[PDB]
Each structure stands twice: as C-alpha cells, then as structure tokens.
Amino acid sequence: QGLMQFTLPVRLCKEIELFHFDIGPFENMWPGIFVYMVHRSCGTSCFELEKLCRFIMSVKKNYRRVPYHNWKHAVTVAHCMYAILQNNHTLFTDLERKGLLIACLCHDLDHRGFSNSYLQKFDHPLAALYSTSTMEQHHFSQTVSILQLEGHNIFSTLSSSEYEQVLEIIRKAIIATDLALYFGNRKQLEEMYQTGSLNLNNQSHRDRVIGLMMTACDLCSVTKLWPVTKLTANDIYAEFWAEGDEMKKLGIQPIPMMDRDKKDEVPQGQLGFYNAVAIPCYTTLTQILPPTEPLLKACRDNLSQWEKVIRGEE
Numbered sequence: 001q002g003l004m005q006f007t008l009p010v011r012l013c014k015e016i017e018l019f020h021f022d023i024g025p026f027e028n029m030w031p032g033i034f035v036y037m038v039h040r041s042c043g044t045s046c047f048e049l050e051k052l053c054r055f056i057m058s059v060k061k062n063y064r065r066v067p068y069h070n071w072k073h074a075v076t077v078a079h080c081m082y083a084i085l086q087n088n089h090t091l092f093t094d095l096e097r098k099g100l101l102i103a104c105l106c107h108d109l110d111h112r113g114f115s116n117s118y119l120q121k122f123d124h125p126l127a128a129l130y131s132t133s134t135m136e137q138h139h140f141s142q143t144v145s146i147l148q149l150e151g152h153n154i155f156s157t158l159s160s161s162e163y164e165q166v167l168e169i170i171r172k173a174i175i176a177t178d179l180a181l182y183f184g185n186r187k188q189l190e191e192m193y194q195t196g197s198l199n200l201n202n203q204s205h206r207d208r209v210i211g212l213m214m215t216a217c218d219l220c221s222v223t224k225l226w227p228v229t230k231l232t233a234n235d236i237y238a239e240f241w242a243e244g245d246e247m248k249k250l251g252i253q254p255i256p257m258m259d260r261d262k263k264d265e266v267p268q269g270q271l272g273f274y275n276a277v278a279i280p281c282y283t284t285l286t287q288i289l290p291p292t293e294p295l296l297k298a299c300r301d302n303l304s305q306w307e308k309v310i311r312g313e314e
C-alpha cells in the first residue's frame with residue numbers, strides 16, 4: 001500500500017504545478033489528478049488510499065449534471081488551492097493542507113444551478129433551514145454526510161480535537177465561497193494589510209486569509225488561458241440564464257446578469273466583474289501571499305482579452 005505513488009503523464013506532471021493548468025476533458029482522470037495533488041501537498045500518509053478513493057467517488061456522485069457548478073468545477077477549484085499551497089509551502093499547518101483541498105472538492109456539493117437569491121424567491125425548503133449562505137451551508141452539511149458514510153472517514157486517524165479543527169476549517173472555507181461575504185472579507189483584509197495589523201498567528205486573521213484563498217480558487221476560471229476562460233464563461237451564463245428564465249416563470253424580472261435577452265452585453269458584464277470582483281480579489285491575495293502573483297497577472301490578461309472583444313478585435 002504505502003510505496004504506491006500516483007504519477008501523471010509528463011505534460012500533466014509539469015503543467016499541474018502551474019496556476020493556469022486545465023484538468024482536461026477526460027472525467028475519469030480527475031480523481032487521479034486530485035489524489036496526485038493530495039499526495040504532493042500533504043504526503044501519502046495524510047489519508048488511507050481506499051478511504052479517500054471511496055470519499056472522492058461519493059463526492060463526485062453528489063455533484064449534479066449542471067453546466068457550471070459540477071464535478072469538473074470542484075476539481076478545478078481544488079487544483080487552484082493546490083497551486084497556492086505548493087507556492088506557499090511553509091505558511092500553512094498540516095491540518096490546513098488536509099482540510100482545504102477537501103473543502104475545495106466539496107465546496108459546491110449537490111449544487112442545483114441556482115443562486116441563494118432564487119432559492120429565497122422560490123421559497124425552497126433549504127431557504128427556511130438556512131437564511132444566509134443558503135447553498136453554502138447545504139454544501140458543508142452534504143460534506144459531513146459523506147464523511148459519516150461507512151468507510152468514508154478520511155480523518156479517522158485525527159484526534160477528537162484535530163478532527164474538530166479540520167471540520168471547522170472546512171466549514172469556514174466552504175461558507176467563504178458565498179460571494180456576498182467576499183466584499184467585506186477583502187475590505188477588512190485590505191485595511192489590516194495596510195495599517196500593518198495583519199497577523200497570521202491571529203486565528204481570526206488566518207480565517208480571513210483562507211476565505212480570500214477560497215474566493216480566489218472559486219473564481220480561477222478568469223486566471224486560465226483565454227480559450228478556457230472564454231468557454232467557461234459560456235457555462236457560467238448557461239446557468240445564470242436558466243435562473244433568469246425561472247425568475248420570469250415566478251413573474252419577476254431577473255437582474256441583467258441572468259437575462260438571456262442581454263446576451264450582447266456579456267463582454268461589458270465581464271469587465272464589471274473583473275473590475276468589481278476578480279482584480280481586487282487577486283490583488284489583495286498577491287499583497288498577502290506574494291507568490292500567487294501569476295493569478296493576478298493571468299486575471300489582468302483576461303480582462304484585457306474582454307476589452308479586445310468589446311473593440312471588435314476578437
């Protein structure tokens with residue numbers, strides 16, 4: 001068992017270390033890619049291989065066949081986390097390394113392709129059970145479910161309190177993927193960085209830094225090669241526009257983001273998004289973790305590609 005290191009073909013073995021890596025269209029290799037990432041950022045010791053394989057496959061089963069919030073997104077977001085963890089070797093604890101790749105794999109579990117807002121206006125049962133971060137509290141809830149299935153406790157070797165710390169890291173990490181919470185979280189971090197109050201030994205500071213990392217991994221489609229960025233945007237809008245249709249079915253005008261009638265304004269919508277969300281996100285993250293700069297650089301390159309689309313040059 002212990003002498004069994006997962007290895008990847010040469011092009012993957014090299015490119016998986018880069019922020020901009022695309023996990024590819026071969027579904028059946030994504031589990032191997034994830035285990036490869038856990039082994040290298042954590043050790044072959046972190047998890048019993050049989051248990052982790054059974055956990056990876058139960059997680060996969062519990063993502064749905066929606067255009068964007070799907071199993072490929074889960075593995076994409078984990079690979080970004082893996083790049084961050086490997087470019088900041090010594091800044092993170094053994095538990096953080098363990099908890100965060102799992103958090104990323106699990107962070108959109110059982111997503112239905114609809115925003116918290118649509119669940120609230122539809123009056124979905126999840127919206128009574130969880131008034132804020134509706135889907136994100138569901139995602140953590142599903143994570144705990146899969147962990148408690150026979151033969152799925154990958155954290156079995158942890159002490160009662162180490163186990164509690166790691167489930168607490170996953171919960172806070174998954175909650176942070178609620179983009180409503182990101183704005184405030186980044187503002188606080190900007191201020192603490194600049195007044196020089198930012199302290200990585202302050203647990204509530206680390207928490208904030210991990211939440212910014214989670215937003216960064218979650219938005220990582222904007223840090224890819226242009227053709228990956230552009231084709232992921234089509235999946236993103238395919239969800240948003242179905243939500244827009246469902247909003248109209250309830251007798252509600254959707255926000256412009258979700259109206260397929262406003263297809264032509266996508267380039268301008270992306271600009272706003274890169275300016276309002278992505279750039280500030282990767283800027284503040286680069287300030288706090290200097291070696292994540294390639295994400296900011298790749299983000300600025302894609303903003304510049306959407307500007308070209310608007311100018312009729314693409």
Ligand SMILES: Cc1ncc(C)n2nc(CCc3nc(N4CC[C@H](C(F)F)C4)nn3C)nc12
Pocket residue numbers: 219221222233236256257258262263265266267268269270272273
């Ligand atoms: C790439 C990416 N990654 C992650 C996330 C969550 N998002 N969210 C978006 C949507 C961005 C957006 N599009 C619009 N539209 C376009 C047409 C409308 C116009 F007519 F008004 C307004 N507004 N905004 C804000 N892109 C991404």
Ligand SMILES: [Mg+2]
Pocket residue numbers: 107108135177
């Ligand atoms: Mg989500």
Ligand SMILES: [Zn+2]
Pocket residue numbers: 073077107108177218
């Ligand atoms: Zn996500």
